[PDB]
Amino acid sequence: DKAFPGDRRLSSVMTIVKSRPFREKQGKILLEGRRLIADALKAGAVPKAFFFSRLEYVKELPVDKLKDVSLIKVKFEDIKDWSDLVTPQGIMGIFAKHTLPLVLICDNLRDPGNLGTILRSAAGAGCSKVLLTKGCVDAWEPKVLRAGMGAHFNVEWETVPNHLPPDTRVYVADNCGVQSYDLDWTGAPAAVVIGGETHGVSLESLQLAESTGGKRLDSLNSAMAASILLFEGKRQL
Amino acid sequence: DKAFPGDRRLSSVMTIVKSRPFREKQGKILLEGRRLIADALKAGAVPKAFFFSRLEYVKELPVDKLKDVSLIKVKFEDIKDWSDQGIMGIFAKHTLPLVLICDNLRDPGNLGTILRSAAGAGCSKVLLTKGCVDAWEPKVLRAGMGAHFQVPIVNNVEWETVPNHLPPDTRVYVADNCGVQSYDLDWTGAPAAVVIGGETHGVSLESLQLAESTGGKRLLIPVVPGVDSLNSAMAASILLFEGKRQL
Amino acid sequence: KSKSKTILVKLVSQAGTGFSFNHKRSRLREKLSLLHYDPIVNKKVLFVEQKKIRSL
RNA sequence: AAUUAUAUAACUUAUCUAUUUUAAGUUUGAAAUUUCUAACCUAGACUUACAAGUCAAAGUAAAAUUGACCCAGAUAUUUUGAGACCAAGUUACCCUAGGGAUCCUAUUUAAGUAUCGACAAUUGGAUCAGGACAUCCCAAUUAAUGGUUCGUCAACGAUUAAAGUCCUACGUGAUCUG
């Protein structure tokens, strides 16, 4: 294992992964987890550095978590710099930081955690339409990567406004919250607008989604409710 | 810190609030986070005590967003135990009614949130993982943002309430990925009684046989991708609400 | 508590006298057939395992 | 509180009444309870509420991750079982026992022992940081050397060589009173 994190290159990598602004400046972020790293490789994400433990590297399981990065034995200090979190994972990868439609649009910068959770639900839901703001916010951070958990693995303002012009209604959802399959989120056009993780979604968020022309499906757990909706969304299709 | 130094029950409430095991022992389900506290709060729970940092509980800033949860001092170590988020609002742990059941152990948030999902839809009684499984525990309920006993969604069900959930004449369906169609089931068409088995435990054969008494058909959600199955508890939540609407 | 290696079983006389005694055997081995003293017949006779009592 | 509360009282069912086709439940509470195959035998010993179970000279006899008893089982008398029960307040209605009043400081050391005296050993801020090593940054298996920003039990944004994990009555500036 490589335990030397004091190198200038290691310090730059540590700064980018540890700090989101450094990640945006350096364009590099870290994904923690062998499953998450493997999903990144399938998605085509190009990893810059692969963090493998002294035992994980020998087992080659961390090597499979390269996510297109070069896999080399790494100790805690080296792994910590590669990983965006303080605690480095055994397998981690340092990578870059209509009619009856299912569309979710988020303008401006979005919380990296929210993006990962939303993307993970989207993979289960299988929505054919996705909307987002520019790439300013980095969703490759270890916290964001943890939110995706491999399930997650640039629409900008102009295209994002196009989704808003479309006549779609965002199905409401709440911890307490009509039925999930009784809402035409997939059966009818949907423009998912709810309180993001960066701002927080209260019971008003469910009402706000209802105000978008949708009905109820009180803050619901982002992972649990989104996963439940994704299963209902698949049934809707 | 204990809610009241002399009052042992106050200390237990505070400890149970910020403690997955202690909450299960004390039958308390905490909703970590002020917004999640409101989640359990708006789901029909009036948390007697809320796990929050001693100084934070005194300030009661998350209590403002608890919207029912009663801010209570919580030890830092206890807060970590209940971590799934600081404002853990500890709370006590029909025909065509929404019915979710996260049978067996599963993701703490999935079980709690899935059970609560039925409550808002009009669930007469929503269910979660059994008392043995950690679903109503402070940390377990914390991720779900729901209370077991107080909210219709129950996790510290115990033996008595456990038959109660099944005992209703609502056709039941186990929903993971391919348990007819999630919303087009006999159970979904009839009163909702969805009971998804644990993700790592599955559905018991006896439970499948018991489904005959209910008359429901296990939930099968078509999946375009090759994923083996979706969140079991999450599937139950969708089936839970879906059944009520169809019924 | 979680660990479990041996088990306790009833060894019953094959002479029909009804005399039985308990012995410990590994869970992963075959049923025991042992020659043991039976007081009723006052001589050693064959004993065959019938039922498992508990996990040791 | 914890557990209840066939004192009574009610309702329900009986009961008992009309027609005609008190008891048992439950609830109030008079209250109550508790707390805050791997032997047998036999000196001398172990373990143990009791009991059983152990070690062991001699003797005799076969051979060469629980642990007993009680207590319940099974069957026909043979076998099989793993000294505040649990449990909050309040008392100036009380009782008894008493205790009061009626950056220093104390040692040790002594760089600079008349008089002194470092280093040591025994609400937010501003200013300045000290310390732990389980090493983030800086540095050569070794090392705590100095540092580790500003904001919005988790998380995010922007910088920084880095924003380790933390401790030091907001770490640390000299209201006023009880």
Residue numbers in the entry:
A (entry chain x): 95 to 191, 206 to 261, 268 to 291, 337 to 376, 385 to 404
B (entry chain y): 95 to 178, 183 to 191, 206 to 291, 337 to 404
C (entry chain 1): 10 to 65
Per the authors:
S-adenosylmethionine (SAM) is the principal methyl donor in cells and is essential for mitochondrial gene expression, influencing RNA modifications, translation, and ribosome biogenesis. Structural analysis by cryo-electron microscopy demonstrated that SAM-dependent methylation is required for peptidyl transferase centre formation during mitoribosome assembly. Our cryo-EM analysis of the mtLSU from SAM-depleted mitochondria reveals ten distinct assembly intermediates demonstrating how methylation can orchestrate mitoribosome maturation. During translation, peptide bond formation occurs in the PTC, predominantly formed by 16S rRNA during the late stages of mtLSU assembly and involves the folding and methylation of the A and P loops.
States A1-A4 are the earliest mtLSU assembly states identified here, characterised by an immature central protuberance (CP) and an A-loop of H92 held by an MRM3 dimer, which would typically methylate G2482. These states exhibit a relatively low overall resolution (4.6–7.4 Å) which is sufficient to trace CP maturation and the dissociation/recruitment of assembly factors and mitoribosomal proteins. Here, we observed four sub-states (A1-A4) with bound MRM3 dimer, which differ in (i) binding of uL16m (as A1/A3 mature to A2/A4) and bL36m (as A1/A2 mature into A3/A4) at the base of the L12 stalk and (ii) maturation status of the CP coupled with the dissociation of DDX28 (as A1/A2 mature to A3/A4). However, in states A2 and A4, the conformation of H89 correlated with the occupancy of uL16m, where H89 is lodged against uL16m proximal to a basic patch on its surface. It is thus likely that in the absence of uL16m (states A1/A3), H89 becomes disordered or displaced. In states A3/A4, DDX28 dissociated, allowing the recruitment of bL33m and the adoption of a more mature and structured CP. The MRM3 dimer remained bound to H92 in these states, but the weak density suggested that this was only a loose interaction. Early states (A1–A4) exhibit an immature CP with MRM3 dimers bound to H92, poised to methylate G2482.
